[PDB]
Every structure is written in C-alpha cells, then in structure tokens.
Symmetry: D2
Subunit: 476 residues, 4 copies
C-alpha cells in the first residue's frame, strides 16, 4: 500500500490531508492514511459535476466505451495490487479478494458493452383518428449529477455497479466510499483520472456518515444511489428531497433444500457453506437460514456440521484461510449477543460458535426460534440457522417470514416446486439449484420489501440514471 492516498476532486488527485486512518482489519494496525473530504470539498465536487453535464453528454458512445475499456485493461494489469489492498482494508480472504477483482472487471466489461447499446425506441402513435399523422421516438438522456454511496463489504464491485453505469450513461457523479474501506474506490479514482473524461465528471471523496449530509440533501443531485444497511437506506430516502432514490440493502436470505436432494447433498452442502460463510457471512445475500426437508434433514445436518467445522479461520492473507475477521470487534459482539440470546432461549450451536475479537468461527445452529433477532435481523456474519420442514408451501412461507426480500434459493428437481417458488417467494431473485448468494454482474439485482428499491446490474442501473426524452412528430 501507498503511505498516503488523495481523494479525487473533479477528476484530479488532491492530497488535502491525511486524517482518515485505514486499519488492517486482521492486525488492527493502521495500514495507510487517506484525505478526508469536508463539506466545502463535497460542495466543490457537486458544483463541478453540474458543470460537466454538458461536456460529458457531448461525448459519443464509443468514447465512453473507450474510457470503460481503459479501466478494464488497467484493473487487469493492477489485479494483484487491487486484491491485496482489498485483503488488508476489508480483512477479506485473499482468494475472495481475487474473486471480487474478477467481478470488478466483469462489471466494467459489461458496462463497456452496454455503453454503445443504450435503448431508444419508436412508438406507433396512430391509435385513434385524433392521432393520425403523429409518430413517436424516444431516447435516453442522462438524469443529471448522481450521488453514490457504497458499503464496506464489496468496496470495489459495489462501487463499480454505480460508477460503471454512470460512465456508460454519461452522468457526472460524486462517490462516497465506506470510510473503513476507501482504498479500492481511490484506486478506481486513480485509473479514471488517466482518461480524457471532462473535468468534473467524477469525484471520489471519503467522508464519515456524520459529514455526509450533502450526498443526500443537495438539490443539484438528480439521483441518490445507496448500497448499505436497510436502517440507513430508508432513513436517507426520507431526507433526499426531489431526487430519484435507488436503494440496495440487505436481508436474512434463506435456502430451501427439497425432499428430492439426497443424491446431491455433497453439492448442496458445499454451496450452502460458501453462501453462509464466504467473506465471513458479510454479504447482502449471504445464506442465513437453511430450510431443509425432513427426508434429507439428517444426512444434510451431519454433512453440514462436518463441512462447517472444516473451514479454516485465520489470517486473510493466507490462501488457506476461508473465514477471515469480521469488519470490527463491535460487529462480532453484536452478532455474538444475538447468538447468545438465541441459545438461552433454547437454540443449540452444533458447529463452531467461538468468538475472539473480530474472529468469529463459522457457526451452525439448530432450534433458533423464529422470533429471535438471530433469525429475523441481518446476521452479516458467519452464522447459519438450520430448520426442518415437510410441506413445500410451509417452506415457502418460512422464506417469506421476514421483513426482507433480496434473494432466495431452492435446491430441487421438481419443475412444479421451482415454478411455485418463482411465483410465491417475495424476493428480487429466486435461485434454483444454487444458494441465494449467487450473482452475475449483468443480471437484474436488488430487493423488495425492506431489502431495496430498484435494480442494479449494468443495464438496469443505466435505466435509473437516464430519463426518457420523447419526440412526437406531426406530419400533415
């Protein structure tokens, strides 16, 4: 890592200060220092984004594509640097960190392809005699300056899912990364600064939530796009004013294991362990609830206990580590408190369960009451809950027994069960024969209920960052 990082104000690196300390989430020592933006800098960034609307809009589509393709090439060259920085600032196991840099590249690559493909349309207006001679044409224009707020757990790829569409769509933006994990955003900033984007087209400004009011309230932003916790996101919607609001939040995702799965339980168990425990459960679609049919429950339980106990916890820089530290000791203590309450109420820890500082073991529980915080709130840690069902409709009801609705998974070979799950699960996406934790970066992605408002995935984010501009032409 560099000794200091700047922030990016109107496309240019500014070593304004070194007030924001970023710690190695495993050793707790300060790893680097970056410049912290104050309100005057955020205001300057917004002013410059307003000024860049017209130059940015004049860029032809192939120039936007070229800019995105430059990012792709440089992320490829700097692949291991990006992964190592992610490993340090997020505590993310090095193999998962490489997974994320691969996705970062995927996301920018899809955006490069979509930048020359933005949907326009023709509409037939001659639907009645009054409208004889009229024809309709629409194209998508930038919504205007965008305010982007990203979280700690995928500090490259979840920032990418706003930055890359904005570049494809021609919106200037100001991005506030997570203060705990700002480095990846600032490496994206350095790469973007090398392109011929108009000055003001982007700023990337670290700022604590307590100094971030302008990202929500400033009327010069036309879009607020927030990825993070449900409690924060719904509060920001209340204060956004006139701008459009897109929310990517979290949930307590469930995976159903159907009665017909005996012969493939080793496959199911492997995916369940990945979904529940990769990057230590700190995924908005991490597996938290496992709803297993009575016919397979016993063999699944035995296999899942074994697999869970086998996952190495420790130094995320070690390729053998599967379970790194949680983002902070305080977050481990929150989850450990929910776990202890669940246990005192009758639940049993059947694998794992030890917590030391931010080091939370991969843990499996049985008998968690559905009214427990551990069941109903977002665990965001390496805990999974196993329950048993015999009626498939009851399994669906259990998945839906939640404030949230991001993604769900169903392991089944029953056509009608897959159909019924698609129809009845009140989630953004249903995954068949994999865990809810699966995402590919072109697919529409987001939540309903308390889990979000809108869809990301390149094409869908561009939709929200643009406005239809209709032309009606009358011929006489």
């Amino acid at each position: 890592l560099k000794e200091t990082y700047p922030y990016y104000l109107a496309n240019e690196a500014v070593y304004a200060n070194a007030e924001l300390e970023v710690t190695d989430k495993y050793t707790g020592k300060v790893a680097t220092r970056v410049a912290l933006a104050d309100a005057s800098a955020i205001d300057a960034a917004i002013a410059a984004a307003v000024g860049a609307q017209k130059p940015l809009r004049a860029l032809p589509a192939f120039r936007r594509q070229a800019i995105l393709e430059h990012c792709v090439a440089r992320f490829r060259e700097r692949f291991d640097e990006l992964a190592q920085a992610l490993c340090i600032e997020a505590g993310k196991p090095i193999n998962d960190s490489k997974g994320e840099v691969t996705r970062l590249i995927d996301t920018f690559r899809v955006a490069a392809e979509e930048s020359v493909r933005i949907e326009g349309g023709l509409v037939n207006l001659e639907i009645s005699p009054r409208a004889q001679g009229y024809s309709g044409y629409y194209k998508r224009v930038p919504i205007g300056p965008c305010s982007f707020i990203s979280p700690f757990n995928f500090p490259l790829n979840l920032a990418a899912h706003k930055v890359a569409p904005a570049l494809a769509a021609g919106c200037p933006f100001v991005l506030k990364p997570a203060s705990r994990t700002p480095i990846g955003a600032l490496i994206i900033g350095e790469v973007l600064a090398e392109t011929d984007l108009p000055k003001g087209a982007f700023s990337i400004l670290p700022a604590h939530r307590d100094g971030a009011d302008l990202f929500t309230t400033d009327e010069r932003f036309k879009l607020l796009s927030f990825t993070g916790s449900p409690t924060v996101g719904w509060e920001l919607k209340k204060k956004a004013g006139k701008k459009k609001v897109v929310l990517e939040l979290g949930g307590n995702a469930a995976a159903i294991v159907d009665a017909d799965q005996r012969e493939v339980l080793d496959y199911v168990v492997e995916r369940l362990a990945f979904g529940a425990y990769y990057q230590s459960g700190q995924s908005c679609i991490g597996v938290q609830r496992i709803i297993a049919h009575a016919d397979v429950y016993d063999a699944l339980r035995e296999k899942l206990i074994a697999k869970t106990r086998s996952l190495k916890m420790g130094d995320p820089k070690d390729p053998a580590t599967f379970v790194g530290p949680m983002i902070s000791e305080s977050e481990a203590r929150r989850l450990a408190g929910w776990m202890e309450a669940a246990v005192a109420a009758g639940a049993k820890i059947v694998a794992g369960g030890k917590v030391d500082g931010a080091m939370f073991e991969a843990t499996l529980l049985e008998g968690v009451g559905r009214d427990q915080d551990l069941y109903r709130k977002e665990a965001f840690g390496p805990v999974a809950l196993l329950e048993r069902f015999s009626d498939f409709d009851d399994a669906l009801a259990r998945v839906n027994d939640s404030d949230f609705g991001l993604q769900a998974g169903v392991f089944t070979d029953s056509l009608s069960h897959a159909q019924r799950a698609w129809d009845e699960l009140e989630v953004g996406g249903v995954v068949i024969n994999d865990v809810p934790s699966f995402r590919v970066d072109n697919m529409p992605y987001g939540g309903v209920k308390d889990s979000g408002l809108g869809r990301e995935g390149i094409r869908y984010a561009i939709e929200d960052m643009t406005e239809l501009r209709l032309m009606v032409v009358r011929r006489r």
Copy 2:
C-alpha cells in the same frame, strides 16, 4: 341531470355512508350533487381490503384482466353522454371538450386492455464468464402491491384512468382519491368497476379532502404512491411517503417555438396555439403558456393570433358554441388576474382579452411580459398566453428551458437540424414537432423532468412502475 347523491366505493362496493361532500356546478355555482365523504376509518378499511385482495388479484389470468378492462370500455361507450355531462357540470368543462375527454378515457382503457395480455417478461444470458457457466436467467413482472392514487380536478376521468387502467392490467389493488371538486367521474368509474368480477378489495374509490387524506401518503401498506396534481403538493407528498415508490405527474409553463420558416402554415400554427393556450380555459398541465416566435413571422403571427384569440366564444360550458368556460373557482381567477396585473404594471401589454368577471376569464394574450414575472415563471393554469420574439434558434431553446419546469415543449419548424437540436437540448419529458406541447395520445410515455414530475405514465410505462422484476436464476450442472 345527476343523481341526487353518490356513494363511495369501499372494497368494490357502493357505500352511501353520508352525503357530506357537496359538488357545485362550476358555472352556476350552485350545488349539483352530494357524495359520500370517506373518513380515516373508511380509508384504513380500504387499505386493509387492498392488502387482502393481493393474492386473489394476482391469481387472475391475463385474459380475465383484459375482459374486465373491456367491460369498462363498453360501459363507458354506453354511458358516453352521461359521463361528458357530469364532467361538464363538475369541472365547468365545455361540452365538446368534455366529450373529448370521455373519448380519451375510452382510449386509455382500450390501450390497457391490449397491454394486459402482453406484460413484459424476459430471458437473460448469464454465461458471461467461466464462473457463471450453466446458469440461465428468466424474469417476469409481478404486481408491486397495493397502490395509492391521487388525481386532480382538470381531467378527472382520463388522469384517474391513467392510474386505474394500468393497475387493472398489472394486478395491483388500489385506493383512488379523486379531487373533491370533481369526484363524480371517478365514482361513475367505480360503479362500472363494481359490475365486474374483480376480487373484493381490488379497488376502493374514496372522496376525501386533502386535510383528511394523510393516509394516502403515509400508510406503510401502500407500495406505490402515484400522484397527479400541482408541483407544490407533489414534492411535499414525496417527502412524507416513507418507504413506498413515488410517481409524480405535475405541471409547468409549457412553451411553443414558431420558427422562421412557418409563414405559409401560420393559420395552422395559430389554430394549434389557440387550442393549446385556451382549451378548457388553459387548465391543462401542458397548456401553452409561452409562445416564442421568430422575427421573420412575428408580425403576421401576432395579427393572426390576436384575431384568433378574440374570436373564441366564452360563456356557459353547456353550450356547444363555448370554447372558454369558467375557471375552477373565482379565487383561482383572482390568483391569475393578480399576476397579470403585476406584469402589466411592470410594462407588459394585454393585446387581446384581459377581462375577468368572477370565474369567467377571457382568452387573453400579452406581449412584453418580463421573464422574471410570476406570470412568466409560475404555472398560469388559466386562459393566458405570453408572446415573445426571437431571432437566434439557440436563444429560443434557452428561453424554453428558462424555467423551473420541464413537462413538454413544442416546435413548429421544417428544419431537420432545428428539430434535432430541440430534441437534444430541450429539458422536458417530451418535445412535440409541428404541434403544440399540449398534444398527448394515451399510449405514449408521458411525464415531466425538473420540477414537472418524476416518472412516466402512458399505459405501458405506468404498468412498469406498478410492477417489480422477479428474476429466476437456474443452475444446470
């Protein structure tokens, strides 16, 4: 003649709960009918019924929803004169234009009947990288949930239709609050819907005054608020909406450019300008408020427009000869008259019309209105238009955009390049070429940017906001 009293509709059924809401004839000023006024207990009951109707409504196949919409079309056609006359009374809308809106009401439900059997689904290729080998993606649209609908006084039928008909096509239960000044049209829509086999709770139509309507914005069981009305109200309701999606269809001060090449078609242009500026006495969210005309045609356009404006017949909207009926109230005529007087005091000149008697506001044309005047920058929503002159097309575009609003604009031109530039640079929802900004057909994407709205109506586009994508990812190994 109207019925002596109208019910409201609670969970698909007529309830003559009371007769508290008096509806006046906007021309005679006398009470024309009385209708049932919903209290908060009735609105709460309607919301609970809508929640309960979600699953039965979702269970209806598309062809059943189409049959429900087609029944509405047939009954609206059947009751065409009844609807137009009620509209004429409760809105003071000239009878020919009332008949025009009933025709649009039919069109809107007809488009929705067609769209109900072709709601968009999709396939997604997910095999974009080795990690995703063997995955395929399918998505369909599901109802967003119970919808809260608020409609205004000026197009009570068609602007309610642009929410109700999409909701029927999409399978969303809804609760509609019509404007208290003009609730009869919506209650006739309710009577027609009550004839269909929609599940109970699929719809409620509840008159309520704004000060009793808090739940339409704040109740957490609604998943969408779709509001059509004044910008001042709409942006305030967005602040209080909570978690729900918000769609806003508001107003503006729409402009029309007349280009330098228009000499040979000026009679056509003037006719459309007068229609746009003075149709239903300017009470249109895309009424022509500002006319920006090139110096080359300005003198001939001015003479023709003054003559046309002075020819428009004002009076009893029940008279088919009437083009300018009453404004919705004397207080609204007084509002606009005050801006007009302030503009004249600052140097503007009335060149046609200008006389106001109660709610009877003449079709009025001004020159010399300063760009900083309330008459220029605020939504007139009355039979007043402002004429100004330009010579540089970019100046004309800048003048169109010199506004808080951005709903629609119009450009009369035969220059390909000027049309291209207008489409590119006018910050509006829609640009109309060779007709006024006041044109709308009910299938087109329709809405505003800047302070004029958030989102699009028109059947397909409304369905899109009333539904959520539900993705299915399937892994084969």
Copy 3:
C-alpha cells in the same frame, strides 16, 4: 341457435368484390359424399387480374394508418362472432370435421384475428446507436417495418379457417395486399371470410380469394409480382413449391410425426395424460399437423398407461360429424384412409399389434392404437394424418429424446414430466420448432411462434412472427455534423 343451409353457389373474390364467374368447383360433404354446394373456380386470367390489382393496391393500402387497419380487423372479429354457427356448420360439412371441434376452430379464427387487431397498432420499429467508432461519429439510426409487397397465400383442407387466418390477418395488420388460394376440397370458409372482408373499407385490390386446383395454381408460386409465398400444407408439396418460387421470400408450414414422452413420475396424473394423448392423437381423426402420432412411455408407468389408453381409445365415438357425440369423423377421402390402412397392414405384417380399434370402412377409420411398430416402418416415419397412434416403451431419458428426434420432421413434441432437468434437456435437445411440457405437442395458441424445422417447415407463424416475414426493415441513417 339455428340450423343453417349453405348457399347454392359461392362467388370468388377478385379485388375485394364477389364475382359469380362460374359454378365449376363442386364441394362435397365429406361424410355423405354428396355435393354440398358449388363455387366459382378461378382460371389463370382471373389470377393474373388479382395479382395486378394487388400491385395497384400497395400504395393505397400503405396509406392506411394503423388504427384503420385495426378497425378493419375488429370488423371481421365482430362478424365472425355473428356468423359463428354458419361458419362452424360449413366447416363441419366441407371438412367432415366433428361439429364441436368445428366450433372450436371458429373460436380460434376469432382469436387469431383478435390478436392481429391488437398487433396492428404496435408493429415494431427501432432506434440503433451507430456511434460505435470514430468514423461514425454523429450518425444515428432509425428503422421501421414496411409491407413486403403483394403476398401469395396457399392453405390446406384440415384447419381451413384458422390456417388461412394466420396469413390473412397478419397481412391486414402489416398492410400487404394478398391473393389467397384455399384448398379446393374446403373453400367455403375462405369465401365467407372474403364476404366479410368485402364489407370493410380496404382499398380495392387489397385482397383476392380465388379457388383453383393445384394443377391450375402455377402463378401462385411463380409470378414475379408476388414478394412472398406463404404455404401451409404437405411437406412434399411445400419443398417442391420453394424450388419454383423464383426471387420471392418463401415461408413453409408443413407436417410431421409428432411424439409425446410420458416420464417415469406421471403415475398420479395418468388419467390427465391419457385424456390429452387421446385428444392429440384422435382430434379431427388425427388430421392435424401436430397430431400425436408416437407415444413414448416410461417403463415405470407403461402398463398402467397402456390399459387406460386402450380403454380411452375404445371409448371414442366414431360417426357423423354433425352428431355432437361424434369425436372421430371421416378422414378427408377413402383413398387417404386406404393409404393409412396399407401402412398399418404393413406394420402388422412386420410384427406390430393393433391393441385398440383398427377397423376401417370407407373413409371411416376407427381411433386406433398399435404396439410394436418398427422404427423403419412407413407407419412410424411418415406423416400418418389419420386416427392412428403408436405406443413404445423406454427407460433411459436420453433414449426417449433420441426416439423423438428419430425422424425427418421436427414440428412439435410433448413431454409429461415433473423433472426440472428433464424439461430443460428436452427444451435443449429436441430438434423441433416447439417443445410442450405437460401437454401434448398438439397444443397451439394463436399468438405463439409456431412452425417447424428439418422437413417440417421454414419460418414461423403466430401473428407477430408472420408480420415480421410480411414486412421489410427500412433503415434511416441520419448524419449530424
């Protein structure tokens, strides 16, 4: 409501108007053999005149706005509903089609025109971003669909209303003038449609409907003024017509020997499966281009399915198609029944066994079920087009898929299964136009893409897809500097 009688003579339609040119074409009641009516037979001079009028109608027809074409289509819908019984009874007589299934086809006629009425106001155009490289900076693309030109339509005897409708109704939606030649054995329905179409304000020359025997129909294939030949009929004829079509686009809707797979997991729903198999195999005496000809049933359910299917097949009433109790009416002619009976006799001679039905009397062919038909037999590999189905047994699902594909044809196949992976494998591996899951391949709804691959067709019908073939893209590139 009432028993109708056919008119004594029917005209043909030349440039939208009835011409009682002659009464040379006798149309028989296919059950009684008796001549039912006579219609005007068009000669080559009349065909040429219709083609010339179609050319002349292109510009007027192009000038109709979309809502006018919708109103024309809606008029047909309204009148087909008014004349529902007239159409069903005429269909019953001229095609020998059981009256309940004739009513079913008139319902499809209505649905097909209704879908076309809806599609007529939403014909797709598009925008194209052309700024993909520095050279193309400032260019933008717009495209709309325009009529392909005059269309030649040829339709068969078995679904004479609805298969004509799948060409006529898209042509009206797309704005193509057309000349329709119906099957000489079943021209009445097409001419009733012509009468209804004559009532509309279509420009003169927008349509002609001309009965003509195949030996006098050469211009329908070869005339250079037609820009599209769309043929629905036998594979042998269709592929030959393509060879003689010349420059025009060619669309073919042909036949096949459709198969239905019954998977191992279907025991609890066998009564439903048997009902659909019997419907698919024997509806209109198997004279359907997607009739079930081959049933491929898993060993786990085979014995139970076989007993239920034999009983269901035996229960089917054969007789006068005017009798509403009749499900199996006459085949279209005695010679066609003799063709199929000979293939059946050859299959039995090589070891097959008739396990239900099998009696043939003139054109009255019993609903018949066979076991043990060899895969090399004509009865297996050629289009039966009669009330015969063949039952075979499998255990390996890949072997079942290979058996479905073991064919010159590829129109539709059906699979009864609750296995997600089997449905996916079937979708992926069956070389057919359409795979039906948990119903027979005989299912069709008139908006869906429909057609064959291999020897079963070229192109797709279903309203939206037919419109696409009857139109050309017209691109506009606009350069701004």
Copy 4:
C-alpha cells in the same frame, strides 16, 4: 506475401496444391499461389461441419466471445499485413485497404459483444380460457451448417459479416472466398485455426464458381448466405433446395441533393466524390446516380467537375492514389462500352473518361438517358451520372426508377423531405445528409427489389443463422 497459402479444412491448414494463382491487380504479375479445393475436399468440409454441430452448440457464450476477441487481437497485430495483402490482391488503394481492415476489426468486435446477448423471450400465452395455465419461453439455437460465398471487392469485411455472426451464433460454416481475392479469407482462417473452436467448425476453401456447385446444392447446409452480383445470387437461390437463402447483392445507388444545400456544397461534393469513386466505384452502394435540384445544380456541377478531375489515379500502393485499377481489364471494357453507348445516344462526358487497360478515370457524365445501360445496370466502376430535378416527388420517383433498391442518400435540411424520403424510397436503407455509400457494421444492411433478400449487420445476421426454439409449459 507468403509464396504459397493453404486452405482450411475442418480448422486445419492443408497445403493440398498450389493451383490457384492470385495476381497483383495493378502489375498483372502473379503475387502468390493458394490451394484450390476440389469436390472431394468440399464434401469433407461439409461432413466435418455436420460433425461439429453438437460440440459447437455445447460451447457457452463466453467461450464464443473469447474466440472472437482472439480474432480481434490478431487482426490488430496483423493490421499492416492484412492491408497490404488487400492492396495487392484487390488492387485497392492502400488507405482504402487500411479502412477495410479497420472495418474487419469493427465487425468482429460487434460480434464478440453480441455473442453474449443473443435474444430470447417470454411470451404470455394466457390470452383465452383454453390457454389458462400455459406460459411461453423461447431461445435461439443454431440453424445448422452454413454455406458462405463472398465477393472480390470487400474480401475481408464482407466475409467477416458472415463468419463473425456464425461464430457468435454457434453455426459451423464452409466459406468460399472470391478466387481473385482469397488471401484475406485465408489469413482469417489462419487466425481462426489458432482458437479452440471444435474441429469441423470452420473450413475456408478457394474454389472457382465452376467447381462450387456443392456450396449451393448440398442438403447438409441449412443456410446459404451469398454476397455478390445480382445475376449470380438470384440464380443460386433457384438451385438452393430446402436451405434458407440470404442474398446481399448490388444496385445503381442514387444521391439526391436538395434545393437548400448551397451553404454546404463543398461537403456534399466531397461525399459524392467519395461514394462514387472510392475503390474505383467497386462498391455495392457506390454512388452511381446524382439527382440535384435546379437551384444548386449549376454550382454543384462546377464543384463536382473540379473535384472529380483532382482525384489521382495510379498505383494503389502509393498512398496518394485514390483511383486504383478496376478488378480486370474486361470489367473496364464492360463499363467503357456502356459509357460509349450513352455518349452515342447524346450523353456528355464532363470529367475524366479515359480508360487504359484496367485504369478507368474517375468520370462524370450528363444527359444519360434513363433507358441506357449506364443508367439502369450496376456500373461497378468509377462513373457517376448527374441529372436535374425541381419537384421533390420527381426526385424520389427517379431514385425508385430502377430494378434495384439497396441504399439511397438525400442531402437536405427539410424535415418533411427527409420524412418523405424515408417513406417512399424503396431501398433497404435511406441515408440523410451523407451518400448511400455509408455503412457502419452493426446496422441492419441489405437490399429490396433485385438488390437482396435479408439483412446483415451482426445482430441481423445472427437472427438468420438461428431458429426459435419455443418451450410451452402447462401448469394445472
């Protein structure tokens, strides 16, 4: 150039013989020798294509994309080699040759992007009570083995418009390039041979038209896609048998100059000279007929005579050459015979007109009667005809006064004239404010009337190389 080139049989270089001599079209000397495929080799290629169907269909989309991206990267590496080979075997001026190599890269680039977004669909089938419970899904599958025939004038890019879609769609193909210009196609074959396409996925086989019968008649091909002269194309359609036929032919394209174009006449004349005389008019959308309004006719005529005379004719290896040799002396004699006939009937040569062997000057004529061969047949040489109009409907009627209908151009600033041109010109494509000679490689491209049947451009070609495969699912 290499001394000898192989052909490609089932993805492999085969030095079967050196029988096909390829000449330098300017010097006339033999430049190289290539292997000539006989009927046995064509048969083996077709058999190998049938065998490759299932392995090729098994490739996931991202693998097809990587194969196409490999081609793009290698064409960039071999850019000068491709351009010089084109300049020799086609006699194409070197700057025009580098232009075509750039297009070759564009075409493959677009195909790589489209390979991962081939359209499928959902259809709502519940349109009547009979169809309650049914749902529709469709995807596109390869049509099968494709027969490709390409012409001499754009040897690289017009072959690319068949090859690249086939790779994106998963169809095996056998390509027969033009015998006069096969080197480009064989360099493409060498690059394709480097990839992990299954053996049999592609063959590229030089063969003279007289030995090419199997490319039209073999029933194992499911598609014939031909680009070349109208006379050959319509003949091949008649012999194609059951296979689908796609035809990209030619025409006598027209450009209208409207009455309002005085202020931009230098631009108009520049584009006219480009469209009429680039690669010596040997383009299927070369400008052959110029229809100019009386109001600007005299000023355009003067500027166009001066422009045409300024164009340097000579050695195509010299970058200063704009007008290289025509493909053969006999093709020059053909065009010069039509020119002499039109002059004998009263036309006047007003610029150029000199022909020496295959060196045909950029030439402009007036007064060519509309019944002349020079007017109605495809000139395919550096000759353009100027005529005059006053009524816009007359100008439209003149454009349509042809057997052909590929593209037309209209220089106008009249909105209504542009709308009318779009509506009434019976062509595949109308170009507004550029010549009909414009093409970008993603746009739908093709002719109506005698000019073609079907559309190329990557997305549109893929549509013709695939079949819809519908799945109807009944739930009860």
